């Protein structure tokens, strides 16, 4: 608040023997009488840099720089050293960068979607996820940051015909257009190489 | 320029985003209320003042009385039909 | 020893405020301005307003207004579906 500690009527005394010049509370009879207030130090006084709303919360970025980063992040996938370092237990599947049918996008069903992914070979990744459900380390638990699970693949979609509502729910998974391409989804923690499953249409549309 | 006590009067447009959504929702609401109409009045072309900008044109306020009469209709029907008017 | 002679009140109760601040030689309260109409609302003291204001006590009527507006200031009874 603007007024922490200001809800006090303290004032300093002058010269004494066991005392300080810190302002003491007026009145009598309640225990806060004669107690100090109005300082960085004192119990139930204010603080130093009473924080404010007008901090520099959101930071500006150049558009070209943002796009440069998206491009590099998408380049990340083709090499697969970065992927196998970051996570993404891929070592069985033959090919990188993956492409699949555009017929994926017509899927309307979680079960069919995950069965497709298991056929393709992301079994290892979606069993890494759904075994890495551990709690949060500290006080995030009671600021609604409670569970934490490792991240999983990303299924690009050129145009949705229900895949997004299939993969909304199974954990680890995200979906994303070719236009939006959330860098926070692609290169998390500034660690390149998220595991990606493109479709034919989206890959063509990337050109 | 802070010798005054500015610290109580500060405006911080966090709500840029929320205002935007409310605004788009208001647009859509007015349009669905106004369902067949185009949500905007036809506004003319006008050539600006202040010789710096005289090359440009600008979508002004309202067309005129005389131009409407040259089209061969009246203001009274224009403002129903979806057309603006300035008179001054 | 000059407090043997304090048995003689200045201040006593107000019928409105119940704070024992009715001054007697002046016939005026000091918290709520009674006899006067306009209740004493002084912005330099914020705790005072915070103590005496709305929300504190019963709100016999005004707690019902939100309910009443929400259901539209209606009259009648139910239909016994």
């Amino acid at each position: 608040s603007e007024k922490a500690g200001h809800q006090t009527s303290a004032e300093s005394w002058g010269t004494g023997r066991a005392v300080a010049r810190i302002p003491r509370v007026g009145g009598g009879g309640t225990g806060r009488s004669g107690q100090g207030a109005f300082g960085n130090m004192c119990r139930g006084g204010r603080m130093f840099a009473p924080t404010k709303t007008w901090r520099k919360w959101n930071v500006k970025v150049n558009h070209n720089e943002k796009r440069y980063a998206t491009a590099s992040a998408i380049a990340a996938t083709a090499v697969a050293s970065l992927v196998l370092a970051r996570g993404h237990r891929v070592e069985k599947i033959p090919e990188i960068p993956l492409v699949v049918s555009t017929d994926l996008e017509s899927i309307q069903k979680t079960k069919e979607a995950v069965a497709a992914l298991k056929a393709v070979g992301a079994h290892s990744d979606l069993l890494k996820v759904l075994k890495s459900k551990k709690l949060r380390a500290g006080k995030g638990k009671y600021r609604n940051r409670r569970w934490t699970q490792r991240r999983g693949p990303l299924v690009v979609y050129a145009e949705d015909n229900g895949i997004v509502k299939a993969l909304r729910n199974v954990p680890g998974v995200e979906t994303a257009n070719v236009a939006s391409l959330n860098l926070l989804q692609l290169a998390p923690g500034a660690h390149l190489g998220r595991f990606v499953i493109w479709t034919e249409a989206a890959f063509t549309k990337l050109d | 320029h802070f010798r005054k006590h500015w610290q109580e009067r500060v405006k911080v447009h966090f709500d840029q985003a929320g205002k935007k959504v409310s605004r788009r929702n208001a647009r859509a609401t007015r349009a669905a209320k106004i369902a067949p109409r185009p949500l905007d009045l036809l506004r003319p072309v006008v050539r600006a003042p202040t010789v710096k900008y005289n090359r440009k044109v600008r979508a002004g306020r309202g067309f005129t009385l005389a131009e409407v009469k040259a089209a061969g209709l009246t203001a009274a029907y224009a403002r129903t039909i979806g057309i603006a008017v300035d008179h001054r | 020893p000059s407090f043997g002679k304090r048995h003689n009140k200045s201040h006593t109760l107000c019928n409105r405020c119940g704070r024992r601040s009715f001054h007697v030689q002046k016939k005026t309260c000091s918290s709520c301005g009674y006899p006067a109409a306009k209740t004493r609302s002084y912005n330099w003291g914020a705790k005072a307003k915070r103590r005496h204001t709305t929300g504190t006590g019963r709100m016999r009527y005004l707690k019902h207004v939100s309910r009443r507006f929400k259901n539209g200031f209606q009259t009648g009874s139910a239909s016994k579906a």
Partner: protein, 118 residues
């Protein structure tokens, strides 16, 4: 206990007699209180009284409404209560009241229902 729908049919004199019986019963039970530790039937009694009184004050109100029916200046505690402002303010008809000039205006030149393709 007592059930109000049983009572809505009864007459005024039946109601008063029933109630006075309940009052005598209550004054007995308040004496029995001082013998016993406690006597929970007094609760049922003291709310039966309220049921009857509520029914009476409801019925007389409805009769007075039927007396004052279809009329202007019905009494203050039977006008609506709504709020000070939403009494001291304009009605539907009184805001719809508008001069004949603008009536002709809104008649001849109303906002037409149009679109744009062609």
């Amino acid at each position: 206990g007592v059930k109000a729908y049983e009572l809505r049919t009864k007459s005024k004199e039946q109601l008063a007699s029933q109630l006075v019986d309940l009052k005598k019963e209550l004054a007995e039970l308040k004496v029995q209180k001082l013998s016993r530790p406690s006597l929970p039937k007094i609760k049922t009694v003291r709310k039966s009284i309220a049921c009857v009184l509520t029914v009476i004050n409801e019925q007389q109100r409805e009769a007075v409404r039927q007396l004052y029916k279809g009329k202007k200046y019905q009494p203050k505690d039977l006008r609506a209560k709504k709020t000070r402002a939403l009494r001291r303010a304009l009605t539907k008809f009184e805001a719809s009241q508008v001069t004949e000039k603008q009536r002709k205006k809104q008649i001849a030149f109303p906002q037409r229902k149009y679109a744009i393709k062609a």
